[PDB]
Each structure stands twice: as C-alpha cells, then as structure tokens.
Amino acid sequence: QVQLQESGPGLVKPSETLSVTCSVSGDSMNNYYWTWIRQSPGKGLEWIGYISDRESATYNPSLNSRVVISRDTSKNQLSLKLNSVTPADTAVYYCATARRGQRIYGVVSFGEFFYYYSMDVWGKGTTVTVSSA
Amino acid sequence: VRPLSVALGETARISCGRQALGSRAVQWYQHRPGQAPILLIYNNQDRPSGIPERFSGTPDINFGTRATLTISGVEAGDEADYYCHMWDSRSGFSWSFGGAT
Amino acid sequence: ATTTLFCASDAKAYDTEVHNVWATHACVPTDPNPQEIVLGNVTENFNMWKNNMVEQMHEDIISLWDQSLKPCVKLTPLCVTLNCNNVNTNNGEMKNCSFNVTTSIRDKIKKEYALFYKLDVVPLENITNYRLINCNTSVITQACPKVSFEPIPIHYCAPAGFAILKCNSKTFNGSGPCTNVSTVQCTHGIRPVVSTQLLLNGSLAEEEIVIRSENITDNAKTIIVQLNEAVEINCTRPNNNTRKSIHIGPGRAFYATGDIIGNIRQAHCNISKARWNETLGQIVAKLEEQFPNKTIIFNHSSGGDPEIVTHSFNCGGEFFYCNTTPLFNSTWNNTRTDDYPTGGEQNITLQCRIKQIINMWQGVGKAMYAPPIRGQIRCSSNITGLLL
Amino acid sequence: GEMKNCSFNVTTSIRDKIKKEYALFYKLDVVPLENITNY
Ligand SMILES: *[C@@H]1O[C@H](CO)[C@@H](O[C@@H]2O[C@H](CO)[C@@H](O[C@@H]3O[C@H](CO[C@H]4O[C@H](CO)[C@@H](O)[C@H](O[C@H]5O[C@H](CO)[C@@H](O)[C@H](O)[C@@H]5O)[C@@H]4O)[C@@H](O)[C@H](O[C@H]4O[C@H](CO)[C@@H](O)[C@H](O)[C@@H]4O[C@H]4O[C@H](CO)[C@@H](O)[C@H](O)[C@@H]4O)[C@@H]3O)[C@H](O)[C@H]2NC(C)=O)[C@H](O)[C@H]1NC(C)=O
Ligand SMILES: *[C@@H]1O[C@H](CO)[C@@H](O[C@@H]2O[C@H](CO)[C@@H](O[C@@H]3O[C@H](CO[C@H]4O[C@H](CO)[C@@H](O)[C@H](O)[C@@H]4O)[C@@H](O)[C@H](O[C@H]4O[C@H](CO)[C@@H](O)[C@H](O)[C@@H]4O[C@H]4O[C@H](CO)[C@@H](O)[C@H](O)[C@@H]4O)[C@@H]3O)[C@H](O)[C@H]2NC(C)=O)[C@H](O)[C@H]1NC(C)=O
Ligand SMILES: *[C@@H]1O[C@H](CO)[C@@H](O[C@@H]2O[C@H](CO)[C@@H](O[C@@H]3O[C@H](CO)[C@@H](O)[C@H](O)[C@@H]3O)[C@H](O)[C@H]2NC(C)=O)[C@H](O)[C@H]1NC(C)=O
Ligand SMILES: *[C@@H]1O[C@H](CO)[C@@H](O[C@@H]2O[C@H](CO)[C@@H](O[C@@H]3O[C@H](CO)[C@@H](O)[C@H](O)[C@@H]3O)[C@H](O)[C@H]2NC(C)=O)[C@H](O)[C@H]1NC(C)=O
Ligand SMILES: *[C@@H]1O[C@H](CO)[C@@H](O[C@@H]2O[C@H](CO)[C@@H](O[C@@H]3O[C@H](CO)[C@@H](O)[C@H](O)[C@@H]3O)[C@H](O)[C@H]2NC(C)=O)[C@H](O)[C@H]1NC(C)=O
Ligand SMILES: *[C@@H]1O[C@H](CO)[C@@H](O[C@@H]2O[C@H](CO)[C@@H](O)[C@H](O)[C@H]2NC(C)=O)[C@H](O)[C@H]1NC(C)=O
Ligand SMILES: *[C@@H]1O[C@H](CO)[C@@H](O[C@@H]2O[C@H](CO)[C@@H](O)[C@H](O)[C@H]2NC(C)=O)[C@H](O)[C@H]1NC(C)=O
Ligand SMILES: *[C@@H]1O[C@H](CO)[C@@H](O[C@@H]2O[C@H](CO)[C@@H](O)[C@H](O)[C@H]2NC(C)=O)[C@H](O)[C@H]1NC(C)=O
Ligand SMILES: *[C@@H]1O[C@H](CO)[C@@H](O[C@@H]2O[C@H](CO)[C@@H](O)[C@H](O)[C@H]2NC(C)=O)[C@H](O)[C@H]1NC(C)=O
Ligand SMILES: *[C@@H]1O[C@H](CO)[C@@H](O[C@@H]2O[C@H](CO)[C@@H](O)[C@H](O)[C@H]2NC(C)=O)[C@H](O)[C@H]1NC(C)=O
Ligand SMILES: *[C@@H]1O[C@H](CO)[C@@H](O)[C@H](O)[C@H]1NC(C)=O
Ligand SMILES: *[C@@H]1O[C@H](CO)[C@@H](O)[C@H](O)[C@H]1NC(C)=O
Ligand SMILES: *[C@@H]1O[C@H](CO)[C@@H](O)[C@H](O)[C@H]1NC(C)=O
Ligand SMILES: *[C@@H]1O[C@H](CO)[C@@H](O)[C@H](O)[C@H]1NC(C)=O
Ligand SMILES: *[C@@H]1O[C@H](CO)[C@@H](O)[C@H](O)[C@H]1NC(C)=O
Ligand SMILES: *[C@@H]1O[C@H](CO)[C@@H](O)[C@H](O)[C@H]1NC(C)=O
Ligand SMILES: *[C@@H]1O[C@H](CO)[C@@H](O)[C@H](O)[C@H]1NC(C)=O
Ligand SMILES: *[C@@H]1O[C@H](CO)[C@@H](O)[C@H](O)[C@H]1NC(C)=O
Ligand SMILES: *[C@@H]1O[C@H](CO)[C@@H](O)[C@H](O)[C@H]1NC(C)=O
C-alpha cells in the first residue's frame, strides 16, 4: 500500500521560483522511478520527465531545462524545483511512479531496441496558478 | 472528439493519432471527469490487475495503420476520457499524451 | 599441348528463352553417359601453378561480363551535383539525395529524389553537397533487370584430337607426379562463384583437409585450404524497400530506391560457433607440421578498401561486404586455445554492408550499377575452403 | 607566328561546372572565324 499526497503553494507570482512536494506514504524512494505530470485545462496531459535510482533524468526540452527535480528521502517525499515560471505553466499537477519496459525488434547486439515507461500509481491532484493576482 | 455513448451491451471503438511508421509500443489511460488519469493498457495488449477482459488493443503489423482501443460490452463504469501515449523506434520522441478524447 | 576449349551445359535448364549472363544458349548439351577410361600403369606429373585453363577461364569470365551491359543504359547524365539529408529516423547509412536532371525532352528540367547508400558517395568540398562515387574516372553502366546472375555450372570440353587427363589420388598436393590417372573429354561441373576471402559453393576433399601452396616457405605465395566437411552460413538483408523508375532520355529508364517500409536493420550472416571451432582446430594440426616449433595466430586483415579486406559475395542480386574480424581472433600453441569463452551463445554474427557501384576485377574505366531487388533477401551458402 | 597561345571554356568531367584552359598549338590547325583575333 502506497499513497501520494501533493502539497504546494497553491498561488504564487510570475517570474519567480516555485516548489511543489509530493509526500509518499508506503515505500522508500530508492526502489521506484518518479515523475510529475501537468495538465493544462482542456488540452492533454504533459510529462515533464523522470528521476531514477542512479539519479538518471532527462528533462523536457520544451520545458527548456528550467526544472530540477529534488527529492526528500528522509521524510519520504518527492519535491520539485522550477525557476522563472510563466503564466502558461498554470496546470493541475500530479505525482506518479514509473516502471521499466524494453521493446526489442531486431538483433539485440546491434542496438535495435528501445525503452518505454508506464505510470501505474497516481497522485491525488492539486492546482498551482501562475497569475499576477 | 467523436462521442460514442450507445445504450449498454454494444461494442465501442476509439482510434488514436498519427499514422504508424514503424514498430510501436502504445499505452492507454482512463481520466475520469473530475478524477485522476488511470492506466489501462501497456505494450498494446497487456492488462494490469483490476481491469476486466473487455479491453483489447492493436498489434505490431503497424506500418501505416491506426492504433485502436476496443471496448466490447460497454457498462456504466465505462464513461471517461481516454488518452494515448505514443512510442515508435522511427519517428523520434514524445512529450505529450496524444490527442484528447 | 595448348588449345581452345568450349562450353557444355545440360538441359535441366533451357526451357525458358532467357539470357542470363553466362550465355547457356551457345553451350552444347553434355552427354548423359560420360566415358572415363582408367589408364594402366601411367604416371603423368601435374602442376597446379602453371596451368593454361586458369587464364582461359579468367579471360572468358571477363568477356562474358562484358557482353552483357553493352546494350544497356549509360549513366553519364547522372554525374551531377547532389544535395542530401539523412533519413527521417529517430533524431546514417542511406541518404535522401535530390538533384536536377534534364528530362526526355532536352529543353526542360526536372527535380528528382532518390535514396541510396553511403559507400556510393564522395563529399565534394553550411549545406552538405556532394557527388557519386566514381564519375570522374569511369563510364558507368546500369545492368538490366530480367538478367540473371545465378552461377549455373560450366563444363569444359576439348575438341577432337585432344583429351583431358585427370588425377584420382586421394591426397595430392600441387606440383607432383601421380600413379592413378584417368582420361575424359569433359570436366567437372564448375560454378563461376565470384567471391573473396572464402570459397562458397565448392567441392570438398576426402578424408582430410588439404593445404596447397607453390613454395610454402616463401611468404609471398598464397595458401589454398580445402576442407572435407562443409560449414554452413546463413545470410540475409531484412529491409522491405521499394523501387522508383526515373526516365532519362528516350526509352532509357533509371531504377533507384524509393522508401523503406518498416524498421531499419543491418545485414547479419550467423556462422555457427562450435562447428567452425572444429574446422579451425583441425586446420592448425596440419599447419603445425610445416612450422613445427612455434605458436600460430590468426590476425585480421589490413585497413584499406572495403572490397579487398572484407568477405564480398553476391546474394541473389545484391553484393554483400561482411567483415571477418569476429572470425580471425585466436592464438594456438598445442591445438588448444582460450579465445572462445565456451558459453554465452552460439551463432557468431558478422556485419555486412550494401554497395551498388562495383568495379570488380579492378577496372580503371568501367563500373556497374546493380539495380535494387524488391523484397527481402536470403542465401544459405555452403563454405568449402579459404585463402590465407 | 607559327605557334598560337589559345584559351577556351570547357565543360569538365562533372557536368555542371565551367573550366578555362590554355594550350599552344600550331598554325595550319586553325581557321579564322570572322580587334581581338577570335578563331
Ligand atoms: C542471426 O542470429 C540472430 C541471433 O544471434 C537472430 O536475431 C534474432 O532475430 C529475431 C527476429 O528475427 C529477434 O526476435 C525478436 O525478439 C524479441 C524478444 O524475443 C523474446 O521476447 C519475449 C521476452 O521478452 C518472449 O516472450 C519471446 O518468447 C516467445 O516468442 C518466441 C517467438 O519465436 C517463442 O519461440 C518463445 O517460445 C516464446 O513463445 C522471446 O523469447 C521478440 O519480442 C520480437 O517479436 C516481437 O516483435 C516482432 C516485430 O514485428 C513481432 O512480429 C512479434 O510478434 C513480437 O511482437 C510482440 O509484441 C507485440 C506487441 O507488443 C504483440 O503483438 C506480439 O504478439 C508479440 O507479443 C522478435 O521476435 C531475436 O531477438 C534475435 N536474437 C537476438 C539474440 O537478439 C537472427 O534472426 C539470425 N538471422 C538469420 C538470418 O538466421
Ligand atoms: C532516440 O535516440 C536518442 C538518442 O539521442 C535516445 O536518447 C537516449 O535515451 C536513453 C534512454 O534514457 C539514454 O540512455 C540512458 O541515460 C541515462 C541517464 O544518463 C544521461 O543523463 C545524465 C543526466 O541525467 C547524463 O549525465 C548522462 O551523460 C546521460 O546523458 C542512464 O541512466 C541510462 O542507463 C540505463 O540504461 C543502460 C542500458 O541498459 C543500463 O545498462 C543502465 O544500468 C541503466 O539501466 C538501469 O539498470 C538497472 C535496471 O533496474 C538499474 O539498477 C540501474 O540503476 C539503471 O536504472 C541510459 O544510459 C541516452 O542517454 C539518450 N541518448 C543521449 C545521446 O543522451 C532515445 O531514447 C531514442 N528514442 C527512441 C524512441 O528510440
Ligand atoms: C536546380 O536548378 C534550380 C534552378 O532554379 C536551382 O535553383 C536555385 O535556387 C536558389 C535558392 O533559392 C536560388 O538562389 C537565389 O539567390 C538570390 C540572390 O541572392 C536570392 O535573393 C534568392 O532568395 C535565392 O536564394 C537560385 O537563383 C536558383 N537558380 C539557380 C540557377 O541557381 C537549384 O539550386 C538546383 N538544384 C540542384 C540540386 O542543383
Ligand atoms: C573474438 O570473437 C568473439 C566472438 O565470437 C568475441 O567474443 C565476445 O566477447 C564479448 C566480450 O568479451 C562478449 O560479450 C559479453 O559476453 C558475456 C558472456 O555472456 C556477457 O555476460 C556480457 O554481457 C557480454 O555480452 C561476447 O558475448 C563474445 N561473443 C561470443 C559470441 O561469445 C571476442 O571479443 C573476440 N576477441 C577475442 C580477443 O577473443
Ligand atoms: C568563358 O566564359 C566566361 C563566363 O564568364 C566569359 O566571361 C565573360 O567575359 C566578358 C569580358 O570580361 C564579360 O563581359 C563584361 O561586359 C560588361 C559590359 O560591357 C563589362 O562592363 C565587363 O567589364 C565585362 O567586360 C562577360 O560578362 C563574361 N561572362 C559571360 C557570361 O559572357 C568568357 O569570355 C568565356 N570565354 C570564351 C573564350 O568564350
Ligand atoms: C608434392 O609432393 C611431392 C612428393 O611426391 C614432392 O615431390 C618431391 O619433392 C622433393 C622435395 O622438394 C624432391 O626432392 C623430389 O624430387 C620430389 N619428387 C619426388 C618424386 O619425390 C613435391 O615437391 C611436393 N610439392 C609441394 C609444392 O609441396
Ligand atoms: C526524401 O526527401 C523528400 C523531400 O522532398 C521527401 O519528399 C516529400 O516528403 C513529404 C513528406 O511526406 C511529402 O509530403 C512530399 O509530397 C514529398 N515530395 C515533395 C516533392 O516534397 C521524401 O519523402 C523523403 N524520403 C524519405 C525516405 O525520407
Ligand atoms: C594484428 O595486427 C595488427 C596490425 O596489423 C597489430 O596491431 C599492432 O599492435 C601493436 C601492439 O603493441 C601496436 O603497437 C601497433 O601500433 C599495432 N599496429 C601495427 C600496424 O603494427 C596487432 O597487434 C596484431 N594482433 C596480434 C594478436 O598479433
Ligand atoms: C569489422 O568489425 C569489427 C567488429 O568487431 C570492428 O571492430 C571494432 O569496431 C568498433 C566500432 O566502433 C571499434 O570501436 C573498435 O575499435 C573495433 N575493434 C575492436 C577490436 O573492437 C571493425 O571496425 C570492423 N572493420 C571495419 C573496417 O569497419
Ligand atoms: C599563354 O597565355 C597564358 C595566359 O594566362 C599564360 O599563362 C600564365 O602565364 C603567366 C606567366 O608565366 C603565369 O604567371 C600564370 O600562372 C599562367 N596562367 C594563368 C592561368 O594565368 C601562358 O604562360 C602563355 N604561354 C605562352 C607559351 O606564352
Ligand atoms: C599395371 O600393373 C600391373 C602390375 O604390374 C600389371 O599386371 C598390369 O598388366 C598393368 N596394366 C593394367 C592395365 O592394369
Ligand atoms: C576523382 O575525385 C576523387 C575525390 O575528389 C579523387 O580521389 C580522384 O583521384 C579523382 N579522380 C581524378 C582522375 O581526378
Ligand atoms: C584409381 O581411381 C579410380 C577412380 O574411381 C578408382 O576406381 C581406382 O580404384 C583407383 N585405383 C587405385 C589403384 O587406387
Ligand atoms: C622457396 O622459397 C625459399 C625462401 O625464399 C627459397 O630459398 C627457395 O629457393 C624457394 N624454392 C624452393 C624450390 O624451395
Ligand atoms: C513489403 O511492402 C509491400 C508494400 O505494399 C507489401 O505489399 C508487402 O507485403 C511487404 N512485405 C512484408 C514482408 O512486409
Ligand atoms: C622446435 O625446436 C626446438 C629447439 O629449438 C626443439 O627442441 C623442439 O623439439 C622443436 N619442436 C618440436 C615440436 O619438435
Ligand atoms: C604454449 O603451450 C603451453 C602449454 O601447452 C602454454 O602454457 C603456453 O601459454 C603456450 N604459449 C607459449 C608462448 O609458451
Ligand atoms: C573450441 O574447441 C576447443 C577444442 O575442442 C575447446 O577447448 C573449446 O571449448 C571450444 N569452444 C567452444 C565455444 O566450443
Ligand atoms: C545457430 O546455432 C544453432 C545451435 O544453437 C545451430 O543449430 C544453427 O544451425 C545455427 N544457425 C546457423 C548456422 O545459421
């Protein structure tokens, strides 16, 4: 049994530094892969990236590398750091787990495979608005 | 979007986005209105615990054809919004979850 | 003596009126009951290294390749300036080139698109901009489709008043006498397989593997190894690629490659490990008598062109260029080694690569453009000997 | 003179570029075509 608990500021000012923490309840963070998913209203979901056991991360180039995913393994909490936020970053946020998956289609030794990720355990939901008011 | 809300007992079909262009590995999701998005299908057919056998998918003959979720025997707990995460070895990356439905 | 020799090829073929490349319409049908006179106490001496039949066959094979692709398309209007990009894969070996060409009416102009390989291009001098591989030193000629390359056997017959002698000794080197000699008028069923580094659809020896050289102490003499049990190889090319048809001038069409439908894969060959281990182990037991003090190692070849240092052959229409670095590793002292890990996997793989433009027999003014084969390719050859 | 130093545009081995070349050759190999002597 694992539970995810979003906790952020709720409302901030633009062109500043933001931080949202997903408290994890049920397992230590060193066994899972972690991710955040933002949802602009009306449009589809967006995947900002991931973080792994050996600090493996590849952030979204459309996020323009303004994000650094931070972690609190002592309190068992998944945090987030993001600077110079824009009013287009107003989105419903989610924290979620990730699993390993490998697809093979030719001979393996030539490197004809790739990796894909599934998200099974989802958060509960929060809303952070980047607005001048 | 195309609305497909027939009285219960029929078979529904929802198609995904881009033409195929290589071997795929496509996910599916269940975003209930006002709720969190819930994983349904990974690896084009595989089904985790807690989902009935009424859902199926599309194999990897892909090669220019569309991916499709199929819901045979639609019930009352089958009305949500479904997304479509994309992967193929030939067309680059993905950072969005496909066109909404 | 020394004379001319003529072809003989029987009628298991010759039901279709097609012309492949080794004419077979002008080949006389061979005899169903070939007479072999076993001679008496007759001792003739043979010399493998001074034989006129070899130079006759070399001149014949060059002239047969020169008969065809004389009434074929010249690709002189194709040495022009080529743009390029890479193929739209994730984020290469084939290029998507584009070029201006004059049309069939020499008053207008046309823009085209074609995919073909690296190893068939040379860079010209930012936008990358280049030209084709061999269009400043040679006139280049497209081979026709519906013209076959399959190596059907050739018998050599001697005219009346002549005869061919034949060695029947089991273990016979080069350049020695014999004591079991037969006579025929018509040779073995010899197949014109053009290949480097290895001998594919050949003839096997009997009860031993036999090593031949002219002067084995001299290191500038090549060594011919003939096995006694075959070692099967299984090559392929897994790409479902189409073909275009660009028309250049009056009644002359040019056949390029179109798109690729599916994945992008390489062109492996899968030789077996334990079987070839047995073969390479019993070669060196015969090698350790000609040099009976030393360790012997098998090292790979030396740099250079891809069509000299690699195993090159013809696989149903394309020309493969696999390199044999996974084969020739090892080091042997007492007919044992530790260079194969006795575990992990079988099936030693090899990396091929495809090449359209070929100037086999080392020509300096002539080339050839093999048009693409539509579909997928398999060979399953039958390795019988090798050249060290 | 019985020699002539001549220059001419040539279309080279690659059928897009124009080269300019020089050669000496004899009289009795020329015909005058029509000041610059242009034959
Ligand atoms: C020279 O030698 C080399 C090796 O040295 C050979 O290279 C081999 O090439 C083949 C392809 O030609 C490679 O096969 C690929 O392997 C993938 C992984 O195989 C395993 O997958 C899982 C484990 O993760 C197992 O379930 C599988 O076992 C089952 O299937 C096999 C099938 O024969 C049975 O024999 C077994 O008993 C099991 O029943 C394998 O162990 C494999 O996934 C892949 O197949 C998928 O992809 C193709 C692409 O089109 C599909 O056609 C196919 O249907 C598979 O698709 C799966 O997923 C989709 C959706 O996700 C579903 O719709 C499907 O139903 C299916 O579930 C492919 O077969 C092989 O890996 C490779 N060897 C090595 C070591 O890399 C060369 O061929 C050889 N060349 C020559 C000329 O001889
Ligand atoms: C299209 O082509 C692009 C090529 O540009 C390709 O991008 C490549 O994606 C892969 C997949 O993520 C990348 O490979 C991984 O990179 C991570 C992280 O390293 C990068 O990031 C850090 C900063 O975060 C940099 O400092 C670093 O230099 C790299 O840039 C690695 O952690 C990965 O290692 C795992 O995979 C290996 C291969 O199997 C394993 O051997 C290894 O151990 C890791 O696997 C896991 O193993 C165990 C399983 O549980 C576990 O114990 C381990 O801890 C570990 O988690 C891997 O190197 C690659 O860097 C990208 N390419 C480039 C140039 O950056 C796309 O993927 C491709 N897309 C498609 C669809 O084909
Ligand atoms: C095939 O032939 C055509 C003939 O038109 C070539 O087209 C050339 O395209 C370039 C790029 O548009 C043209 O350059 C132009 O230069 C002016 C001057 O600065 C600039 O203002 C324009 O915006 C443009 O850049 C060029 O005029 C045009 N024609 C020629 C004769 O060069 C084409 O490049 C050829 N393709 C190949 C692969 O050879
Ligand atoms: C000689 O040729 C052979 C190929 O037949 C080469 O052997 C290959 O060596 C590599 C590295 O030593 C092996 O890769 C590793 O194998 C181990 C064993 O399973 C595995 O645990 C690793 O993950 C990795 O795959 C490779 O398997 C092996 N190939 C075969 C067919 O066994 C060898 O490197 C060449 N050179 C010499 C000097 O021996
Ligand atoms: C070979 O081809 C070149 C191509 O450039 C020819 O060059 C030409 O040279 C003449 C003389 O310099 C150029 O004439 C120009 O005329 C204007 C107007 O009077 C004047 O202001 C300039 O100073 C210059 O004299 C001409 O533009 C130039 N290009 C072309 C296309 O004709 C060269 O003459 C050719 N040689 C032979 C032997 O045909
Ligand atoms: C092939 O084997 C024959 C043996 O029958 C070799 O012939 C003898 O070679 C020795 C050493 O060169 C000479 O002294 C003899 O005079 C040769 N003849 C006979 C009848 O013994 C022959 O040299 C071998 N050839 C090669 C290339 O190894
Ligand atoms: C090679 O490049 C050409 C560039 O023109 C490609 O041709 C165009 O491809 C687009 C993409 O679908 C089509 O919409 C156009 O109709 C094509 N033609 C033209 C004249 O623009 C071609 O597809 C590329 N081939 C490969 C294999 O990448
Ligand atoms: C196989 O041959 C290559 C060269 O053909 C050898 O490579 C040399 O290795 C030595 C090792 O110290 C280097 O100093 C040289 O620079 C390498 N190149 C050349 C051209 O000599 C290689 O050692 C040989 N392998 C074996 C096992 O003998
Ligand atoms: C022949 O194939 C072999 C495969 O083992 C190639 O050898 C290695 O190729 C990799 C490719 O990047 C190099 O990094 C290594 O340095 C090569 N040598 C070894 C000992 O691993 C070899 O390059 C191929 N030959 C040619 C001409 O491409
Ligand atoms: C013929 O005329 C050409 C004119 O270009 C001469 O070629 C040039 O000669 C000068 C003087 O030696 C050199 O500096 C140049 O490098 C030459 N080439 C060019 C392209 O200008 C040529 O020497 C003349 N020949 C004779 C016999 O008079
Ligand atoms: C060959 O030699 C044997 C033994 O010397 C002799 O008897 C025989 O007649 C010879 N000729 C033939 C044709 O066998
Ligand atoms: C043709 O071009 C290539 C590369 O530019 C060069 O290696 C070759 O020598 C050239 N041939 C001649 C005859 O100039
Ligand atoms: C000579 O070779 C023929 C080939 O069939 C064989 O029948 C014959 O027995 C051989 N003779 C000797 C003496 O070995
Ligand atoms: C063979 O090669 C050696 C080494 O060069 C040489 O001394 C000898 O004369 C050659 N010929 C013969 C018949 O041994
Ligand atoms: C190759 O592509 C053609 C294109 O239509 C198709 O008809 C054929 O079935 C394909 N072959 C394979 C083995 O996929
Ligand atoms: C090789 O020569 C040495 C002397 O240098 C000798 O003792 C040895 O027996 C020779 N090798 C073999 C296999 O006889
Ligand atoms: C020769 O063989 C011995 C034992 O057979 C082995 O220990 C040694 O490594 C081999 N090589 C050399 C150079 O002695
Ligand atoms: C190759 O053959 C030798 C000698 O029989 C043996 O020691 C070695 O284990 C063999 N290797 C493999 C991979 O079978
Ligand atoms: C690959 O290895 C297997 C043994 O595992 C063998 O039976 C098979 O013939 C090999 N494939 C070839 C030689 O193509």
Author numbering:
A (entry chain K): 1 to 82, 82A, 82B, 82C, 83 to 100, 100A, 100B, 100C, ...
B (entry chain L): 8 to 66, 66A, 66B, 66C, 67 to 95, 95A, 95B, 95C, ...
C (entry chain E): 48 to 138, 152 to 185, 187 to 309, 312 to 321, 321A, 322 to 358, 360 to 400, 404 to 454
D (entry chain F): 152 to 185, 187 to 191
Tell me, in the authors' exact words, what the paper reports.
The HIV-1 envelope glycoprotein (Env) is the only potential target for NAbs on the surface of the virus (Burton and Hangartner, 2016, Kwong and Mascola, 2018, Wibmer et al., 2015). Env is a trimeric spike composed of gp120/gp41 heterodimers that has evolved a plethora of immune escape mechanisms to evade antibody recognition. SF12 recognized a glycan-dominated epitope on Env’s silent face and was potent against clade AE viruses, which are poorly covered by V3-glycan bNAbs.
We determined a 3.1 Å crystal structure of the SF12 Fab and a 3.3 Å cryo-EM structure of a natively glycosylated clade B B41 SOSIP.664 trimer in complex with the SF12 Fab and a Fab from the V3/glycan patch bNAb 10-1074. We conclude that SF12 binds a VRC-PG05-related epitope with a different angle of approach and an altered mode of recognition from VRC-PG05. Consistent with differing binding angles and CDR loop conformations, SF12’s footprint on Env differed from that of VRC-PG05, such that interactions with both N-linked glycan and peptide components mapped almost exclusively to the SF12 heavy chain. SF12 interactions with the N448gp120 glycan were mediated mainly by CDRH3, with additional contacts observed with the light chain CDRL1 and CDRL3 loops. Interestingly, glycan heterogeneity was observed at the N295gp120 glycan, which correlated with the presence or absence of the 10-1074 Fab. Indeed, superposition of gp120 coordinates from cryo-EM structures that included coordinates for the N295gp120 and N332gp120 glycans showed that SF12 binding induced conformational changes that resulted in the N332gp12i0 glycan occluding the underlying protein portion of the V3-glycan patch epitope. Taken together, this explains why a 10-1074 Fab could be accommodated on one protomer in our trimer complex, because the N295gp120 glycan appeared to be under-processed in the 10-1074-bound protomer (GlcNAc2 versus GlcNAc2Man6 observed in the other protomers).
